[PDB]
Amino acid sequence: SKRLEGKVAIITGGASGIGASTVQLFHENGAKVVIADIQDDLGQAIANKLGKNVCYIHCDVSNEDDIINLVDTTVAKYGKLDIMYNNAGIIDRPFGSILDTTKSDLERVLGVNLVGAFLGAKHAARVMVPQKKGCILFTASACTAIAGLSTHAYAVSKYGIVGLAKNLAAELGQHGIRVNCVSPYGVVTGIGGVSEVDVAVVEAMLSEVGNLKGQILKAEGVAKAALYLASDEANYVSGLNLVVDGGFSVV
Amino acid sequence: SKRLEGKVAIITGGASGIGASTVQLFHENGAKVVIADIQDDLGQAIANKLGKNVCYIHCDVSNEDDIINLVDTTVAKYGKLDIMYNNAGIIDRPFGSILDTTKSDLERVLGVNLVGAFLGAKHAARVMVPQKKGCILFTASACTAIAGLSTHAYAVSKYGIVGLAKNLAAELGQHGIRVNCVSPYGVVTGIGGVSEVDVAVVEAMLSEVGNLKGQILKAEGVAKAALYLASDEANYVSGLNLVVDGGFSVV
Amino acid sequence: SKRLEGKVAIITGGASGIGASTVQLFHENGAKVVIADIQDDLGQAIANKLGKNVCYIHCDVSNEDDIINLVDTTVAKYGKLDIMYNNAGIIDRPFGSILDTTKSDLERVLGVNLVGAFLGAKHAARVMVPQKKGCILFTASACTAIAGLSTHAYAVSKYGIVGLAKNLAAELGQHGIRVNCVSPYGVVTGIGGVSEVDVAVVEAMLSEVGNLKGQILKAEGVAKAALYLASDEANYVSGLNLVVDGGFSVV
Amino acid sequence: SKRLEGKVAIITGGASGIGASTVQLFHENGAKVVIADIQDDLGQAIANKLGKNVCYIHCDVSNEDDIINLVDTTVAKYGKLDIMYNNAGIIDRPFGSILDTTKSDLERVLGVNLVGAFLGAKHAARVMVPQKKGCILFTASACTAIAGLSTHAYAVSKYGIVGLAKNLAAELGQHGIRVNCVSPYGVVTGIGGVSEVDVAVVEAMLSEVGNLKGQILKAEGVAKAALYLASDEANYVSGLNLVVDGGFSVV
Structure with missing residues (x-):
């Protein structure tokens, strides 16, 4: 039942959505967990609830000094880093055309x-x-064309992540390091926005075709994929994009 | 620890190699297991060792009457079928050229x-x-060109299996059924041969670059991938080819 | 305008559909063309119409003696073989479930x-x-799940063909030989059937959503892809599945 | 012989390498060609050499005002835009580790x-x-792990481009627009650098294992792939990554 006993995991975007489900699941499975996010209230509350083997660290992942602080503090606290789950993600204006995407977004x-x-x-x-x-680990996406259900910017970022994971699996394998993606089809509750309006549009689309229990199950399914890949039962699994979408993307 | 409690699994090629590792692991995790193979001595011995929730059934998977007997007997015995792991595989003359593959092989x-x-x-x-x-489930292969380390016939059969799994995931998803592959890079110990000489060539190549403990670990890694995909922790995972190769195929 | 001048091409399934369009286009582009099919009336008529640099040879591609006869006769006639386009294809009962596919089919x-x-x-x-x-060359398919618009048997055969092409590109590249697929989305007019009823079902589905001019354009588009890949302007193109489907398969 | 007669093409990075080969080939095939680059001396010289249906426009493609100027001027000059070939590309320090890539690079x-x-x-x-x-069109890369022969930044950018092309093919297909990539394996002569030292390292690696005639042939092969995809003989080809690498990436 303790499939991560003694392991040290960092989870970005860990204060909500897939990240938060994975924080909880990793904690229930014996890991020490560092929650990295920018939503301090949510993130600190989860750390406080789960107890001593969980802590929260403010980290804007686009800021390299924050990333350094996050990794160095984790290693200083626990002596090692077993799992780095780069899960944080945001979206610009959902379902917009390429014609209307701004450079800034x-x-x-x-x-x-x-x-x-x-x-x-x-x-x-x-x-x-x-x-x-x-x-x-990275949170990516299916490798079919998902922009119609997200945005072109979002889809491009996740395709670039899949390519990063493949190339890092090739470089780091010789050093005993595995590199994988876990991926919902596209957008999932808890994603951030370039603007709050963007979050609001995302919220509307998810509840228009989904139960609350259902978004929670999609997030938990991704979390359980991360649990498998991060455990020793996936010692020989590297370079995979583990898509969790019920098969939606193959047709 | 009982991630398959009460589930009923059929595993073809279950008397050796990946199949046998998966039989054992599924049994340790609470499943009822039907071993299907043509190696009756090995298969019956494993069933006898593991006890009442394991049984052995002779089945040449290329023979549709055997397949019907295997499925119908399992359902008659346990009332249901949760997991069908089509793992049996053989190879013709390893490392041969396309020029020398016979139609018969x-x-x-x-x-x-x-x-x-x-x-x-x-x-x-x-x-x-x-x-x-x-x-x-199916045992397939990496989707790079593996014939150089197997055969063209073998590689073609496993590519066809990946296409089968993708199309069945699309047809059967609407009925609540998941379809996935778990895949070592290419050849693994316990594979059968069109001839015994073929098995002998396979044996030589595996020990030429591998520990016994290492082939056992590759097989156990595939088995643990099958365990994850067959469990309820992969309820939303369908259409995947879960390759277990340490990242060998991405470079 | 003579992008294949002096080249010698064999085209299986050349009496109808994509094969026939490619026969004509290759002939217009200066190649010597051997039409291989089992529809002797159609195939001989095309050869007779196009003239001396085209000939028809009866060949059931599943019969290895026919294949040997086809290749050996072509080489005896022209001294060389530049292009082998394995295009012949048939389908079983379209749009049937996996549950109802017979082993024989x-x-x-x-x-x-x-x-x-x-x-x-x-x-x-x-x-x-x-x-x-x-x-x-091979005629294959898109690599998404096409069985819903063809059959599982058909889709599996075309996935196996894509794997064959990839592995042969790897083996034969060292000998200066290119291996590629050209692929309509799935079924196209001129495909054969396990039964005539199968052809009749195929005919109905194509005209239910398509002009005659449109099926002819899809076939000609595949032919022009074969022309590009077979010409010296694709000297360095190998291992590709060139899908000609207007982008239908990416969404 | 005039496979692009009357078509209007923009080619970024058109002053050197693949871009320049494509400028020349498109011009020989009847297109009006707009060379977009930042190497004004090289680019203007090519325009002057080729004559009236070729012109050069300074354009830093990362600058959206330059891109607008480039497109608007082309349309003002010729009334339409048939082909947009986004080919410009640069690389950071070749063959460096992920550990040493700077954020700035x-x-x-x-x-x-x-x-x-x-x-x-x-x-x-x-x-x-x-x-x-x-x-x-876009110049991308093979979809195996190419960072070992380029950089992680470079490989990630080209993976993101493949995802862009797939998603744009899906959005723009309904409006009659095709979207494709043409792709050398990885780095090719004429690529730019974040620094001149980067260009110098690239130059060394290419001539260490390659004839001058050979780099020219790889570039011309990509150009001829762009010619095919941009012509009406690829009217129904969209969403493809046409890799031109002799099959190097499948093994």
């Missing part, structure tokens, strides 16, 4: 989703390579 | 690997559709 | 589509390897 | 390669949607 989505994932992976690898041990 | 490999998988899936789906519940 | 579709493609590639490679020159 | 590569491609596609689509006609 594109660069904000890429900065948090793609650059932030890149920086988290860079500094986690900095620690994991001397350990010759580690698991770097 | 190609048709034998396709018959056991591809047709046998198709027939097992057909009759498992026959039972699972009324249940609106089920998980159909 | 599956084995007939695999025999013509998959084994026939394998045998054509084997004996073309036999000739092309000493030339250190050649282009082997 | 990553953001520069993404800005030119990914954002620049996005902006070019946005403003080309702005013109092409009212035409209900157009072809948007």
Whole structure:
């Protein structure tokens, strides 16, 4: 039942959505968990609820000094880093045309989703390579065309993440490090927005075709995929994009 | 610890290799397990060792009457079928050129690997559709070019299996059934041969670059992938080819 | 305008559909063309119409003696073989469930589509390897789940073909030979049937949502993809599945 | 011989490498060609050499005002835009580890390669949607892990481009617009650098394992792929990544 006993995990975007489900599940499975987010109230509350083996650290993943602080503090606190789950993600104006995407919105989505994932992976690898041990995860997407149910900026950021994961699996495998993605189809509750209006549009679309229990189950399904990949039962699993979408994307 | 409690699984090729590791692991995790193979001595011995919730049934998967007998007997014995793991596989002359593959060898490999998988899936789906519940698994391969480390016939059969799994995920998802592949890179110990010489060539290549403990770990890694996908912690995972190869295939 | 001047091409299924469009286009572009089919009346008529640099040879591609006769006669007639286009394909009962596919129908579709493609590639490679020159083509499909618009047997055969092409590109590249697929989305006019009823069902579905001019344009689009890949303007293009579907399969 | 007669093409990065080969080939095939680059001396010289149906426009593709100027001027000059080939690309320090990639270098590569491609596609689509006609191309890469022969930043940018192309094919297909990538394996002569040292390292690696005639042939092969996809002989080809690598990436 303690499939992560003694492991040390960092989870970005850990204050809500998939990140929060994974925080809880990893904690229930024996890991030490560092919640990284920018929603301090939500994140600190979860840390306080779960107790001593969970702590919250403010981290804007697009800011490399925050990422360094997050990794270095985790290692200083626990001596190691077993799992780096680069999950934080935001979206610009959902269901907009390519014709109407602004450069500013594109660069904000890429900065948090793609650059932030890149920086988290860079500094986690900095620690994991001397350990010759580690698991770097990303939240990505299905590899069909998901922009129609998200945005072009969002879809591009997640495609770039899949390419990052593949290339890091190739570089870091020789050092005993696994690199994988876990991926809902596209947008899931708890995603952030370039603007609050963006969050509001996302909220509307999710409840228009979904139970609350159902969004929670999609998030928990992704979390349980992260649990499998981060555990020793996936010691030989690297370079995978583990899509959790009920098969929606194959047809 | 009992991630499959009460579930009923059929595992073809279950008398050796990946199949046998999965039989054992599923049994340790609470499933009722039906071992299907043609190696009666090995298969019956495993059933006898593991006890009452395991039984052995002779089944040439290329023979549709055997497949029907296997599925119908399992359902008659346990009332349901939760998991159908079409894992049996054989290979022709390893590392041969396309120029020297015989039609007979190609048709034998396709018959056991591809047709046998198709027939097992057909009759498992026959039972699972009324249940609106089920998980159909296949042992496939990486989707890079693996013939150089197996054969063209073998690689073709496993590519056809990946396409079968994708299309069945699309048809059966509406009936609550998941369809996935779990896949070592290519050849793994316990694979059968069109001839015994073929098994002998396979044996030589595996020990030329591998510990016994290492082949056992590759097989156990695939088994643990099957365990995850067959459990309720993968309720929303369908259409995936879960490759277990340490990232070997991405470079 | 003569993008294939002096090249020698074999085209299976060349008496109808995509095959016939490609016969004509290759002939207009300067190639010597061998039409291989089992529809002797149609095939001989096309040869007679196009003139001396076109000839018709009866060939059941599932029969290896026919394939040998086809390749050997072409080489005896022209001294070389530049292009082998394994295009012949048939389908079983369209839009049927996995539950109702017969073994016999599956084995007939695999025999013509998959084994026939394998045998054509084997004996073309036999000739092309000493030339250190050649282009082997297959008609495949999109790599999304196309069974819903074809059959499971058909989709599996075309997935196996994509895997064959990838593995042959890897083996034969060192000998200067390119291997590619050209692929309509799924079913196209001129496909054969396990039964005539199967052809009749196919005919109905195509005209239910399509102009005659439109099926002709889809076939000509595939033919022009084959023309590009077979020409020297694709000297460095190998291992590709060139899908011609207007982008239908990405969404 | 005039496979692009009357068509109007914009080619970014058109002053060197693949871009320049494509400028020349498109011009020889009857297109009006707008060379977009930042290497004014090289670009203006090519325009002057080729004559009246070729012109050069300074354009930093990461700058959206430059992109607007480039598209609007082309349309003002010729009344339409048939082909937008977003080919410009740069690289940071080749063969470096993830551990040593700077944020600044990553953001520069993404800005030119990914954002620049996005902006070019946005403003080309702005013109092409009212035409209900157009072809948007990108220079991408193979979809295996190419960072070991380029950089992680470079590989990520090209993976993001493949995802952009797939999603735009899905959005723009309903308006009669095709979207495709043409792709050398990875780095090719004529690529720009974040620094000149980066160009120097690239130059060294290419000539260490390659003839000058050979880099020219790889570039011309990509150009001829762009010619096919941009011509009416690919009217029904959209969502493809046409990789031109001799099959190097499948093994």
